[PDB]
Amino acid sequence: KDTIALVVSTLNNPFFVSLKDGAQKEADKLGYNLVVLDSQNNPAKELANVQDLTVRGTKILLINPTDSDAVGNAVKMANQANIPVITLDRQATKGEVVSHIASDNVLGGKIAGDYIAKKAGEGAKVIELQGIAGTSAARERGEGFQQAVAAHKFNVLASQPADFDRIKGLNVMQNLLTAHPDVQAVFAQNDEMALGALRALQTAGKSDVMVVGFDGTPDGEKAVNDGKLAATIAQLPDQIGAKGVETADKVLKGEKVQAKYPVDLKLVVKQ
């Protein structure tokens, strides 16, 4: 029985427990023994986990980095030991990686935009609240939304960062609202920003302006069920873990794998 190892950023969040669960079910299904190591959101422990795995002759390393920049050296221990590395959710800035499996953030953003078109109409006047500048999530969600901006002929009144934060989402939306009162819809690159933006619009007496979030968090999905948030984009973390294990399998069977395998996601609306 061959062993596939999974170094997970943390098991303290439901998102990553699903990622582990999806990886476990797929591994069982493909006939592998999955060794799971928790990094406890600490790069030093992640580094120790990868070193432990190298000396125990692991065939492939599935690693969900605690941080893209900090994982560099952990990937390098695996690279030198000749253990193929596959990243999950977060990319590794440095180090040789055979494949990266994450959500299809581009499709996510396009989905959000298509929904805005469905409810606000073609050529709608929209505002976009971006995530932290430089992060891959903000970049990919942004280009996905731009695909919907082109296809649906959206007029983007404003597009500014709110750094994936609820308080900044609130304050930025407040500023943009007064400067662009003709806004018909908002696309926030995470539920925190969307909720922040919702709070801002509620305070100005503008709950007729639809807000679309992203992430499918407990708070985000709750807001959709209450009829506050028009929608959210839920990720499928279990599918990231499953696809990662399957890609490891293809690598172990002597196959050449794609660099990326963007995982599908779903539009969450009321009902």
> What does this entry list as its resolution, in Å?
2.3
Residue 43, CA distances (Å) to 38, 70, 145, 156 in order:
11, 6, 33, 39
Radius of gyration over every alpha carbon of the chain, rounded to an integer in angstroms: 20
Burial 26-63 (b: 16+ CB within 10 A, else e): bbeebebebbbbbbebbbebbbebbeebbeeebebbbb
Taking the domains of the chain in order of start, what are their residue ranges?
Answer: 1-101+238-261, 102-237+262-271
Fold of 102-237+262-271: Rossmann fold (3.40.50)
Domain 1-101+238-261 has CATH 3.40.50.2300: yes
Q: CA-to-CA distance for 165 and 69, rounded, in angstroms?
A: 21
Identify whether the C-beta of residue 54 lies closer than 8 Å to the C-beta of residue 81.
Answer: yes
The answer to whether domain 1-101+238-261 and domain 102-237+262-271 are alike in fold is yes
Structure tokens at 193: 């920003």
| Strand-strand pairing, 232-234 and 60-63 | unpaired
Residue 256, CA distances (Å) to 3, 105, 174, 190, 268 in order:
20, 24, 49, 34, 35
Q: CA-to-CA distance for 183 and 208, rounded, in angstroms?
A: 10
Is the Cα torsion angle 154, 160, 162, 166 positive or negative in sign?
Answer: negative
Query: DSSP state, 260?
Result: B
What's the gap between Cα 269 and its chain centre?
Answer: 19
Q: CA-to-CA distance for 60 and 2, rounded, in angstroms?
A: 10
User: Strand, helix or coil at 54?
Assistant: helix
